[PDB]
Ligand binder design. Structure first.
Ligand SMILES: *[C@@H]1O[C@H](CO)[C@@H](O[C@@H]2O[C@H](CO)[C@@H](O)[C@H](O)[C@H]2NC(C)=O)[C@H](O)[C@H]1NC(C)=O
Ligand SMILES: *[C@@H]1O[C@H](CO)[C@@H](O[C@@H]2O[C@H](CO)[C@@H](O)[C@H](O)[C@H]2NC(C)=O)[C@H](O)[C@H]1NC(C)=O
Ligand SMILES: *[C@@H]1O[C@H](CO)[C@@H](O)[C@H](O)[C@H]1NC(C)=O
Lengths: 50, 57
């Protein structure tokens, strides 16, 4: 296992889907907020729909 | 463009992800995008341009 800052990891991941990695860095806060909201929505969905 | 920026403590190089191979940072390894007021963790350095010396001489 090799350490690597999570931001650069997501930069690699975005590169992996044909999106210039500058997109992530220029939009890091938006991505973080969307991901947190998605996690919250998952928490809500599991707690209600058996 | 390909690889990541690393530093041996004093100087900055750009090297491929899977195998260390430091190279001098130039316009052949980096592409410009945006400005310095948005990126998080962006550092300061100088990027040597291959073209400058040819025209200077
Ligand atoms: C980081 O690497 C650079 C590049 O080799 C080192 O600077 C060079 O050091 C050698 C001596 O080992 C000199 O002969 C070169 O002239 C230096 N390069 C330049 C551009 O001046 C630097 O010392 C390294 N830093 C550490 C902390 O290892
Ligand atoms: C990187 O360099 C820039 C300048 O190229 C630095 O920007 C300075 O920021 C301070 C703090 O607001 C200002 O007072 C200076 O006027 C800025 N410089 C210029 C030329 O406008 C920046 O601080 C540097 N950052 C690092 C980490 O080295
Ligand atoms: C990295 O973490 C240090 C604390 O260890 C903090 O001072 C610094 O601002 C952080 N920089 C970035 C780009 O996350």
């Amino acid at each position: 296992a090799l350490q690597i800052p999570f931001a650069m990891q997501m930069a690699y991941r975005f590169n992996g889907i044909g999106v210039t990695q500058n997109v992530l860095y220029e939009n890091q806060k938006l991505i973080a907020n969307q991901f947190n909201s998605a996690i919250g929505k998952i928490q809500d969905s599991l707690s209600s729909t058996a | 463009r390909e690889g990541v920026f690393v530093s041996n403590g004093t100087h900055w190089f750009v090297t491929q992800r899977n195998f260390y191979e430091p190279q001098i940072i130039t316009t052949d390894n980096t592409f410009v995008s945006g400005n310095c007021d948005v990126v998080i963790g962006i550092v300061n350095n100088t990027v040597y341009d291959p073209l400058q010396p040819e025209l200077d001489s």
